Every structure is written in C-alpha cells, then in structure tokens.
Enzyme design. Sequence first.
Site, PDB file in Angstrom:
ATOM      1  N   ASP B  62       0.817  -1.082  -0.256  1.00  0.00           N
ATOM      2  CA  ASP B  62      -0.101   0.134   0.094  1.00  0.00           C
ATOM      3  C   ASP B  62       0.442   1.055   0.223  1.00  0.00           C
ATOM      4  O   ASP B  62       0.718   2.457  -0.381  1.00  0.00           O
ATOM      5  CB  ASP B  62      -0.867   0.462   1.257  1.00  0.00           C
ATOM      6  N   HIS B  96      -5.145   2.460   3.639  1.00  0.00           N
ATOM      7  CA  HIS B  96      -4.834   1.264   3.646  1.00  0.00           C
ATOM      8  C   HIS B  96      -3.770   1.114   4.259  1.00  0.00           C
ATOM      9  O   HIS B  96      -3.620   0.747   6.011  1.00  0.00           O
ATOM     10  CB  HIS B  96      -4.700   0.125   2.150  1.00  0.00           C
ATOM     11  N   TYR B 100      -3.261  -0.312   8.921  1.00  0.00           N
ATOM     12  CA  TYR B 100      -2.388  -1.309   9.416  1.00  0.00           C
ATOM     13  C   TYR B 100      -1.485  -1.123  10.751  1.00  0.00           C
ATOM     14  O   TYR B 100      -1.823  -2.250  11.746  1.00  0.00           O
ATOM     15  CB  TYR B 100      -0.829  -1.507   8.328  1.00  0.00           C
ATOM     16  N   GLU B 153      -2.474  -4.943  -7.783  1.00  0.00           N
ATOM     17  CA  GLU B 153      -4.374  -4.637  -7.387  1.00  0.00           C
ATOM     18  C   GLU B 153      -5.153  -5.504  -6.920  1.00  0.00           C
ATOM     19  O   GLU B 153      -5.747  -5.559  -5.905  1.00  0.00           O
ATOM     20  CB  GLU B 153      -5.157  -3.261  -7.885  1.00  0.00           C
ATOM     21  N   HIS B 190     -10.040  -0.109  -7.971  1.00  0.00           N
ATOM     22  CA  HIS B 190      -8.901   0.068  -8.491  1.00  0.00           C
ATOM     23  C   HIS B 190      -8.165  -0.645  -9.734  1.00  0.00           C
ATOM     24  O   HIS B 190      -7.539  -0.111 -10.896  1.00  0.00           O
ATOM     25  CB  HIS B 190      -7.530  -0.059  -7.223  1.00  0.00           C
TER      26      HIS B 190
HETATM   27 FE   LIG Z   1      -4.289  -0.228  -0.491  1.00  0.00          FE
HETATM   28 FE   LIG Z   2      -4.687   0.381  -5.191  1.00  0.00          FE
END
Ligand SMILES: [Fe+2]
Ligand SMILES: [Fe+2]
Lengths: 282, 282
Positions: B62, B96, B100, B153, B190
């Site tokens: 990410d 994203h 985490y 992705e 995406h």
């Molecule tokens: Fe992502």
């Molecule tokens: Fe993405």
Amino acid sequence: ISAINWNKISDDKDLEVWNRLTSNFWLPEKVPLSNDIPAWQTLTVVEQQLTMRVFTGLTLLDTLQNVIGAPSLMPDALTPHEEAVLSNISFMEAVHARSYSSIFSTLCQTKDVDAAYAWSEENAPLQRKAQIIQQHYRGDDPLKKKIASVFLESFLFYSGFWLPMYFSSRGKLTNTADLIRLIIRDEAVHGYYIGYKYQKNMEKISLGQREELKSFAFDLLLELYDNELQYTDELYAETPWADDVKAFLCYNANKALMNLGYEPLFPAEMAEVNPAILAALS
Amino acid sequence: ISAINWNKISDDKDLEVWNRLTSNFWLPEKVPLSNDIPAWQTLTVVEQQLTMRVFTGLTLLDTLQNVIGAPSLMPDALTPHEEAVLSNISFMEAVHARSYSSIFSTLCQTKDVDAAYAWSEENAPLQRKAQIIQQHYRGDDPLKKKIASVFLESFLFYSGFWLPMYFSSRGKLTNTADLIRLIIRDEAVHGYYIGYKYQKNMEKISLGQREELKSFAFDLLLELYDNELQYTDELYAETPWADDVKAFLCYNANKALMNLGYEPLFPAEMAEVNPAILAALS
Ligand SMILES: [Fe+2]
Ligand SMILES: [Fe+2]
Ligand SMILES: [Fe+2]
Ligand SMILES: [Fe+2]
C-alpha cells in the site's frame, strides 16, 4: 521503500493534521445545492456573470494545487507521514475543483459557464498569478515552493471567496456558501500546515538564507497583491464591492504571512473587514 | 493548465469510478477494532506472529502504491478526470497503509510489531515482488506500468488478504476482517479501472506491440506467481493453510488477467477456493 508506521510518529503535527483533514472529509453531493436555485434567480445578469467568473478562477487554482502544487511538495517532506498528508491535500484539491462543476451544473446555463471558462483562460491577472506560483512549484528551491503554496492557500483564493460570503450575509446562495466554507476549512489547515513545515525546514538553514527568504516572501506577496488588486478591479467593476474585497485581501495576506511565521504587512486601516463578512465566514 | 470541467466528461467511466471510490470513503477509526481484542487472545503465538507478518507485507505494498504506483500513472492519463481519480486512489492507498498501524496499535505488542516490520525488510520474496513492480513504475513504458499496477491491485495482496478472511470464517477477528473488506472494496475497483485504462490505451497501438504486451503480461504474472508461492511457503509454513492460500492466489491471478482483458491462466482445478473463504469475502 519501507512500510509506513503510524505508531512511530516523529512529528506529532503530522498526525494532528492527518486527523483533522481526514475527519473533515466532504463531497459536494452532501450539500443541497439545488436549494439555491430560487436565490440564484433573484440575482442580476451582471451578478450571475460575476459569480461564474469568480468560480472558474477558483477552479483553476484548485486544479493547479491538485495537479502541480501539493505533489511538488512531496519530494521535500521531512517525514513519511507528511508525504501521506500531502496525498490527502492533493485529493481534497480535486474535490474542491470538482465542487465548482457541481455548482455550475445545479445553478447555471452551460452557455454561460463555458463563457466564464473562456474568460478565465484570457484573463491576464488570473493567468499571471497561476504563472507566478507554477514557476516556484517547478523550481529547484523547496523553501520558495512552500512560500508560494501558503500564498496560494491563504491569500490567492480570497478575492473569490469574498463573493459567496457576501451573498450569504444577505441570505442568498446560502448552500453554495456552506460548500465554500467547507473548502475554506480545508485551505486554512493546508496553509497552516505547509507554513508550519516551512518554519521547520528553516530551522536547518543559514542566517543569511533566512534573511534572503524573508525578503523574497515579502516581495512576492507585494507582487501578488498588486496583481490581485487588478484582478479584483476587472472582476468587480460593475459592482460597489471592490473596496470591501480589497480589505478582505489585506486581512488574508496578513494570515498567509503569520502561517509562515512573519509579521503582518498590512495595517489595521487597510485590513478592516465588514463584520457581516466575518460572521458569514463563521 | 486549465480549470477542470466535470460537466464535459470525455469518458463516462471516469465519472463512474470517481463516484464509486469517493462514496466508498472510510477511515480505520470507523471500524470498532478494539472489539477484536478477545478473539486475538485466543490465537496461538504462531498465529499472532503470522498475522503481524502478513499485515506488514500488505502495508509495504500500500505504501508502494501510494508513494510510487498511482502517482506513476498520472503522466499517462487520457483525461483530466482520470488524473483526479488517480489522486483519490493515491490517497486511499495511504488510508490502507495507515489502517494496518491502527490494527497493530489496538491488538498487538510493540515489540512484536517491530519484529514483524524487521522481518518484512529481510524477506526475500516480499522484497522481490516490491522490486519487480517498482522497476516497471520507474520505467518508460506506460502500458507495462499499468499491467504491473493491475497485478499489484488484483493479485499481489491476496496471499495476505486470505488470512483475515479465514479467521472471519471461524468467527475470529471479525472487525479486522470488516476493515480488510473495505480495503478489498477499493483494490477491486482500482484494478478494474486501471485495467480498463490499459485496454483503452491498447486501442491506439500496433498489432505487433499488442502481442508483445500480452506475452509480457503472461510472463510477468508467471514470475510473480512463482515468487508468491515461495512467499506463501515462508509465511504459512507452521500452519496447514498453504494449499488453500495457493488456490486463492490462482483464483485472483485469473481476475487480474480479466481486468486487463485477457483469458484465465489457471484452470478450475487450481483455482478452487473453499466456499467459507468466498462467503467471508462477501
Ligand atoms: Fe491499498
Ligand atoms: Fe489500490
Ligand atoms: Fe482547494
Ligand atoms: Fe489547499
């Protein structure tokens, strides 16, 4: 390239601003713009034209900040969290730009909107301020990029922002004004944050360069100011509002300077903003 | 540079995807992650270590897509609206990555999280997939960038995504899984959108180059696949789950290919995913 870690923050300000900007997320669809149709009808043809011209100018600047401005600051970030904040800033600039199209679609005739876009392409003072800021964004001097960015975020929008605030104070285009207040809520944090980062980077540089940059910041602001007076005269010519807009410019110029950590340039006599404008801003 | 106009859309897909992604906005704070603390306590030390290692690997990818990937596609955009969509994609990749850290902070001991970050820096297959994708992002070939992006992705996350889906199917870490489903909801669009743009750009190029690219896409996927099997073996070694993860890889590899407009590589015998995993995905 390493996985970012938000539990190892090197500057608390990065997390504070990340949180502020993301929790202020909005989209123009959230504003009931269509409720402004009646008020729009009460505006004169001259006032309607002014509004569309103002808004296309603001769209250009947001487009600039999305495509060029915020991305140009990325290589100069002090922390990976700042890089992430800059990605949010870039995206919200695209939301700002998009929202002007939402207004046009809701309130305006396409022939008139297209005329306003064409006017903006030909407007000398508008193209000059875009050019001046772009030149610094494309330059090799990271500190001058940040000065130019703060001037864009905290000063160059405000000849335009004045108008929906004025209408709001008269009980007209109140939903559009609510939208503009959302844009301003973002721009004010953007200018504060980039100004903060300017100051952080200045901690590392020589006493001589600090003085060169302070002088540069003042000269640039004066040049943008002179150009902005001309832009204002050309926009607001058929209204009695030019003086009010000018005072609003001085008021916001002082705020742009304070974001960079500098003293005000404009005395209170020049920066006196009508209490109704200030109230509409809140 | 011109003010963007969202009322002059040249490809309807740009507006559709803009709308989909922005109306799917989320932040990790919206998920009650702290409700996963009891389930977390029921996991073995080996299972807990696996989870943190998996998640740091996903964070790296990410971070890569935020800092390098989505921005690398910007110069190759067909429309200004696509440029704006790419700004949203870049920002949501930062969300994203950030999420985490939200999981680590809520559920994990810092000493264990730091160990997992260090493991990811040293993991050969993880560093190899990051390297391979980066090489294409930094290259001069816009079409190969898009292939690599779709593989990132629509394929490279899924050895990691498998795990919270599995736990979810067992009634554990259900809030974490809800968060992961939000990430997947973004990644799937995406991959679809960038794959769509790949195909749009392919319309312009020669018959010979189309064939060179199809061959390149298949060879690259096979190479990433082989590497991903090794990554999976090293992650899932002390579990009985490696075969299940591998089938999930094949399943998602076929989806990555379909996003680019190509036929599946992996036969049904290799891409059979346990119905509980599929159910957890929905
Ligand atoms: Fe992502
Ligand atoms: Fe993405
Ligand atoms: Fe803006
Ligand atoms: Fe801004």
